[PDB]
Design a binder for this molecule. Structure first.
Ligand SMILES: Cc1cc2nc3c(=O)[nH]c(=O)nc-3n(C[C@H](O)[C@H](O)[C@H](O)COP(=O)(O)OP(=O)(O)OC[C@H]3O[C@@H](n4cnc5c(N)ncnc54)[C@H](O)[C@@H]3O)c2cc1C
Ligand SMILES: Cc1cc2nc3c(=O)[nH]c(=O)nc-3n(C[C@H](O)[C@H](O)[C@H](O)COP(=O)(O)OP(=O)(O)OC[C@H]3O[C@@H](n4cnc5c(N)ncnc54)[C@H](O)[C@@H]3O)c2cc1C
Ligand SMILES: Cc1cc2nc3c(=O)[nH]c(=O)nc-3n(C[C@H](O)[C@H](O)[C@H](O)COP(=O)(O)OP(=O)(O)OC[C@H]3O[C@@H](n4cnc5c(N)ncnc54)[C@H](O)[C@@H]3O)c2cc1C
Ligand SMILES: CC1=C(CCOP(=O)(O)OP(=O)(O)O)S/C(=C(\C)O)N1Cc1cnc(C)nc1N
Ligand SMILES: CC1=C(CCOP(=O)(O)OP(=O)(O)O)S/C(=C(\C)O)N1Cc1cnc(C)nc1N
Ligand SMILES: CC1=C(CCOP(=O)(O)OP(=O)(O)O)S/C(=C(\C)O)N1Cc1cnc(C)nc1N
Ligand SMILES: [Mg+2]
Ligand SMILES: [Mg+2]
Ligand SMILES: [Mg+2]
Ligand code: NA
Lengths: 585, 585, 585
């Protein structure tokens, strides 16, 4: 006949299939805590050590599964701790529900302890942002929040005065709209636009297909189009893995978290098919300045012609359209453009292998990532933090459609390593999970290594200890007139941190130590989390956006300096392979 | 003839006497980094491990010295990390300048990497919140920011597109207005209002003077008024120390971070002189429901009659007015009210001493704070985190006008322990500095123990490890119907954390271990930071807001249960002492 | 080689097909004015007398044509005047671009004249809200604004520092993405879902189809489904006219801007097909409290199960879905439910006709609307203000698919009549256009009658002068315990107002005056605007939400007072017709 409004709120979450949620309790949220406590069997509460880890893990939930992630923070500081995760969810356009504690309605606007107007705090990050003021409608407001987060692919925030969830409401009034939820049936891709787009791509002398995660369902089609038409593939960094890295005509990604062949080919291309792609460096890097025809496939009207003057922009699903293209084309013989690219990729990969294959001496990030590769199961999930690791993992990880990898793509918040791995292991307890993090990022969220221990989540944590914000140091080397500042700092021994949180750990600093430590980590991680602290050199990884290899473009002095610094003696510029197969620049 | 706008910005900071500032660099703030790098001799940059520690330490700077604290974060996640500190500065009404990184003006609004409209993020927390759009006026905007932060006692935020500080500006145009800065000369307190207020206080049969930090300059006058007029003193928690704790008629503070005698006396008082006080529990706890006359002294017109219907509210400086009162009164003989209170205080203090004086057995927070007292120099500064520690430190620390103590008073953000101690040691390198923190709060900012090590800041860190959010667990015991949730968690060994950051540390769990460990900590801290991890029991400290000691108010069953739980067999209720000296309730 | 940024911005607007835009110049927007001036042959600036009218006209443009409306206001007060129109655009979810003047980037943040941070002002209303900081990127930011406003169906606001449009940019870099524009994809109905929905609809004893403007393209399908299946139709008020009003099974709308048969039928329905409908009164009025099954069709996932729990929800285009239902059903025989409703409608229409058909005496709103009907062309466009006129127009206008009517549906801002008619006549110079408005609403925007004069826009303005806010007076009558306040005021003669702006006008107060005044107006408006000021009685229109006609529910005394007040002696309650055909209430 009556139900507590809090109990009904948890039933709304359960109706929508929310399996787990994150936060830290407080007085301002103890009535939501009270409802969660009665429902331990149906919904799994994860107590984190800092509320940003809960928000980040909620975002990672949605990134991995497509289902709304859920977090909460108490009034004031609990809620404002959420911000780095909430902005990550906004920028990465994934559905997240955030519940914020608030003092009871009798105490609001009284200027009492930790009481403030919380609504303005969340106005910018949130697609939906409301303070609940009635217990009876509270389940509806939560339901509304979830449904809007899904529809708009962003953050819904509800501030909840603590009195409301302890109030009785009629047991029969409230409902969830989970049962109405569905995905649309779209028409077939516009037939005549697709045909026209196909002709333009096929008429190109130096075509590229450049996809992002919008093409995540189209791995098979992308690779078959490439093979059939002899058109090299490049992607955004996040789209690594959609097509297996081993594919010989995968060029990699452009800009900085980038691979040499992709940057080089992009500069030469006359036609780009830009699919499911919102590459944020398009305009600022002038990526398409020499492109003749720009073709686009996107599902979002807001993206149409956004990144470059577009000759044909098809509004449609990536996979459906690429399938439609493939159904109207057939085999083309190998071209000079194709052979030059394949050769360029081969050369690039032998370079990366030479870095990986060093057997002895001072540990670099390159051999550490080889060691990850050697213990990695074919369906492992990588939660990647922010810094050099994005660049190194992009180059070195050997990913297939079976893998997943996540980072903070566009907000680029450091600290995501640990929470992303926690979310990954909670959703996929049977899959191997890595957290690959630099020392600066790992230290931002280090306390939540304890959360992995507490909830028995067998993450393999690999910390890359360079004693630097390496990513930023390299930027300062490029732009700053004065000395390095704030980018070299004191060592933290993360194997001791892990010990302090009661996690098994190792610290290595020599290449020859890798195989036995990674073997042990692999085994330990059948049951318990583990951390390897890899003490690495401060060597700058090859800057793909600053290549000095082409005689027509750079001085011999610049080239020899570059080859020396980046162990790049055997790298050839693309022009070498173009000229080899009869092409100019 | 020309100067870099960034170089001029640093000269503005130097003009205002900014000694040190906190942050983490990024590409979006590397031009401000570049200017800081040339000015290492005049301004000291502190690289923190998480930007919330920089914001919190900036707030603590202003709390301790009265001078603007300065922090920065890079675009996106660097800036949003600042939030817990910035809200602490807003709520604690201290001047803070926060600089936020932003992409260059050529890239703004392009939807590029980590680029967003940052202005809405800071609208709620900031008294002043602007995006700079011109290099030439940039020093003025920073100057304006600082001057408004001081004038309005809050947070000024400036978002800085990274291109601007690398632009040349005329060397002679920019200026700082530091030279104009002054404090007002106020008239004398309103003579006739003060006289009238004095008569009402003196006519009271059960008077109290109840001061907050607004009376920080009036320690001498407060204590002499009390002694002369025979009027017991109570304060807000933050106002502990203004009058020495040893003063026999100091009652303590009310509510929860509270002391028994203050709560009891407040309930009996017929007249309260409320001075420099903005107690946030006034209305919600109905603190003054039985008060006959409410008198107020405050410097802020916004506070006048804010917390209770006020009979006389003098707009004036606390110290000046209390001095003016003292100059028109003379000795009154001891009264029953005064003797009852003195007796009540004595009884209370013998209780606290009995907890402190245990010599052997399971370690409690009480003996740990005694151990702090025994190594504490008379002018030590305490940076206190948030939770049971506020309640325990308030009761146990033996403070005089020579000490300072700071916490997050009203925003009550956990994590402030470490940054507050960092700020304290940077401002006062010759004073002993403690960080007193619970395990939940210490773990939120644990990474910045490394900042103490890096900058050789000899903080004595004392972590109270109960494996609980004890403050919240006790709240759940009081309000929640269902089981404890999110309040008991896994151990973190902070002596291992400290080892991992290369700090000397100890872990203790027995009362008998205290003296030698604290002696070692004291010595180590002559040159280097140190941490003591105190493993304590989960005993609930006596709830001063839930006393069960008075036969007229509670059942004998409730009283015996209370005495048992809180080792309170020898505590008597105030009514016992009132009746002893001839008074009723 | 170069172009002025402001020139490039106007070219973007031209590429997007903007014909006209509204606003008022100022110094802070004179460089955009300058660009507009050079371009007066290709894009048409409409100078209004108040910026709210320009914003409301822009919203109405988009409401009428689906093409983005464009307005602007100068720095400070110019832009804040836009708000009521911008909020109308947000709530009615139509694309609007608002350009806001701002001081030059050299004077921004200097606290100069009318200079402020303008960005927080627009954060709440706007889908996209940015301050431009670079001239080269300005055309892009404008293009970005328009694309987003279209895609997200809402307001894009750009604050433009005045220096930027006077700066030269490379002539060959900027582009518009207008060429790439597409409308969102129309999802298809699941076949099995539609079959399940149809069978639930056919099994109903008391079915209703209840459509909103989401079904504006499915009038034919709605009417054929009603005829074929013998299922009565009802709509939201904005959906009036999608099916011709003369259709004998059209019940009208529910709640207050409502018709008696729709409210009565809805109360009795067992099954509702809710199509392209977001009726904001669903929950608060408990519209569906006795509905057994609720079937929903909507294109927006955010609406599915929002207003009631669904038994079947179809995420698809309304017309595609309704066409699919119609294709799987055949002719059904009449039912008692069908007949009772047909009879209820006949009774209701005879009541409205009796009101309209009065030939002499004190003028009421009803005969004024009859006079509108008599001069109205089959494809007239009605811009309607806010108040009694929504209720009266809803009952009396005889609309068909060939008409359009607009008001401020959801924000419900008064004053929209005048600007909506301005926009109407600009978009459809060969269609007859009415502005129907109460005296309160006409007053708010009365100065822009001068705008119709200035641009020679032949609107037929009809003001309903009751010297009251009648809508609000009636509410006070219903809820307030004390006397009317603020709801009856002094007369304004709008024929004199019209004379003052140099518009031909009449003032009438008797029923017998209408035919000749309206014939004159009809003729005048072949070439120029005209105004009819109709002095009407203070009669309350029949409250369809407070029917007192059924003696099983109301006292005989309440029924007679209701019949007498509303001239409803011949109205019968639905239960009369349900009983005639053998059904209970
Ligand atoms: C430190 C760091 C540095 C980085 N630098 C780089 C870098 O140098 N190089 C790089 O490549 N990346 C880099 N990034 C990642 C980068 O910022 C962007 O997030 C990324 O390039 C955008 O990738 P995307 O287009 O695949 O994803 P999104 O921006 O999510 O875009 C997805 C697109 O596909 C569309 N879409 C979605 N579903 C469909 C569908 N079914 N059909 C068709 N279209 C669909 C969407 O509308 C959208 O346009 C970096 C990240 C980090 C953390
Ligand atoms: C976990 C936690 C729990 C807490 N709970 C309690 C509790 O139970 N009990 C408790 O006492 N505190 C508690 N607090 C602290 C509490 O929230 C408030 O911050 C505190 O009570 C307010 O103290 P105040 O009035 O001294 O300071 P403020 O709020 O800063 O007020 C200062 C006042 O003095 C005025 N003023 C400033 N200068 C002058 C001057 N020169 N002359 C005259 N007036 C001046 C100001 O205008 C203002 O009114 C808690 C803190 C924490 C972290
Ligand atoms: C003074 C005043 C009083 C009012 N009171 C009343 C009242 O008493 N009664 C009343 O009815 N109205 C009233 N309103 C109007 C009211 O506030 C709402 O705007 C209206 O009822 C909602 O109508 P709607 O659902 O047609 O419009 P919207 O709220 O615009 O909803 C349209 C729906 O259709 C969906 N849709 C859009 N396109 C498609 C498609 N192709 N296929 C399927 N679905 C689609 C959308 O997702 C949306 O859910 C009043 C207005 C005024 C000015
Ligand atoms: C400091 C920093 C970075 C350095 C990361 O240092 P790490 O030690 O984690 O990584 P490595 O490069 O040394 O291997 S990257 C970065 C970007 C990409 O914006 N920032 C700026 C930044 C600063 N602060 C936060 C919370 N997030 C950020 N992204
Ligand atoms: C979790 C918590 C608290 C528990 C602190 O746990 P601790 O372990 O630090 O302290 P103890 O009580 O166990 O000795 S106190 C609190 C208040 C006063 O609001 N909150 C809510 C809270 C939650 N999150 C943040 C960042 N700040 C907060 N103040
Ligand atoms: C005063 C008023 C109304 C009265 C309208 O007075 P009118 O004189 O225009 O209409 P009438 O009813 O007398 O024919 S309706 C209303 C609604 C529906 O919200 N409001 C409140 C209102 C008040 N102010 C504005 C700008 N918009 C509003 N909608
Ligand atoms: Mg590093
Ligand atoms: Mg604790
Ligand atoms: Mg009126
Ligand atoms: Na942390």
């Amino acid at each position: 006949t009556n139900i507590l409004a809090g109990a009904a709120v948890i039933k709304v979450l359960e109706a929508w299939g929310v399996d787990h949620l994150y936060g830290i309790p407080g007085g301002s949220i103890n009535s939501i805590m009270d409802a969660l406590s009665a429902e331990r069997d149906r919904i799994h509460y994860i107590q984190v050590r800092h509320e940003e880890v809960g928000a980040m893990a909620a975002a990672a939930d949605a990134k991995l599964t497509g289902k709304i992630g859920v977090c909460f923070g108490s009034a004031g500081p609990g809620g404002t701790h959420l911000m780095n995760g909430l902005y990550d969810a906004r920028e990465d356009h994934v559905p997240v529900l955030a519940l914020i504690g608030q003092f009871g309605t009798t105490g609001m606007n009284m200027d009492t302890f930790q009481e403030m107007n919380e609504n303005p705090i969340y106005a910018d990050v949130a697609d939906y942002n409301v303070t609940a003021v009635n217990a009876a409608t509270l389940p509806h407001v939560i339901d509304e929040a979830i449904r809007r987060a899904y529809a708009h692919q962003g953050v819904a925030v509800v501030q909840i005065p603590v009195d409301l969830p302890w109030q009785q409401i009629p047991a029969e009034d409230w409902y969830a709209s989970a049962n109405s939820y569905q995905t649309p049936l779209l028409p077939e891709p516009d037939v005549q636009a697709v045909t026209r787009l196909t002709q333009t791509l096929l008429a190109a002398e130096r075509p590229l297909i450049y996809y992002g995660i919008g093409a995540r369902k189209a791995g098979k089609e992308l690779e078959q189009l490439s093979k059939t038409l002899k058109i090299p593939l490049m992607s955004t960094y996040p789209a690594k893995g959609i097509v297996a890295d081993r594919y010989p005509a995968y060029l990699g990604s452009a800009n900085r978290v980038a691979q040499k062949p992709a940057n080089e080919a992009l500069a030469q291309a006359d036609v780009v098919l830009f699919v499911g792609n919102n590459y944020p460096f398009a305009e600022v890097s002038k990526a398409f300045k020499n492109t003749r025809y720009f073709l686009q496939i996107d599902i979002d009207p807001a993206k149409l012609g956004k990144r470059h003057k577009t000759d044909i922009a098809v509004l449609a699903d990536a996979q459906k359209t690429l399938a439609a293209i493939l159904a109207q084309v057939s085999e083309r013989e190998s071209t000079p453009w194709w052979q030059a690219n394949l050769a360029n990729v081969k050369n690039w990969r032998a370079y990366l292998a030479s870095l990986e294959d060093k057997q002895e001496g001072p540990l670099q990030a390159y051999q550490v990532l080889r060691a990850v590769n050697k213990i990695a199961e074919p369906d492992a999930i990588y939660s990647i933090d922010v810094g050099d690791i994005n660049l190194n993992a992009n180059r070195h990880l050997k990913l297939t459609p079976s893998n997943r990898h996540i980072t903070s793509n566009l907000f680029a918040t450091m600290g995501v390593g640990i929470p992303g791995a926690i979310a990954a292991k909670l959703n996929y307890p049977e899959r191997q999970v890595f957290n690959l993090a630099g020392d600066g990022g790992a230290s931002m969220t280090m306390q939540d290594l304890a959360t992995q221990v507490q909830y028995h989540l067998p993450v393999i944590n690999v910390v890359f200890t360079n004693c630097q914000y390496g990513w930023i140091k390299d930027e300062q080397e490029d732009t700053n007139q004065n000395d390095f500042i704030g980018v070299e700092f004191n060592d933290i021994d993360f194997s001791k941190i892990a010990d302090g949180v009661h996690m098994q750990a190792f610290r290595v600093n020599k290449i020859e130590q890798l195989p036995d430590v990674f073997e042990q980590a692999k085994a330990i991680a059948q049951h318990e989390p583990v951390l390897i602290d890899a003490v690495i050199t401060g060597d700058r990884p090859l800057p793909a956006e600053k290549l000095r290899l082409d005689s027509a473009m750079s001085s011999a002095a610049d080239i020899e300096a570059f080859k020396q610094r980046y162990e790049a003696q055997d790298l050839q510029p693309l022009s070498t392979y173009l000229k080899q197969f009869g092409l100019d620049d």
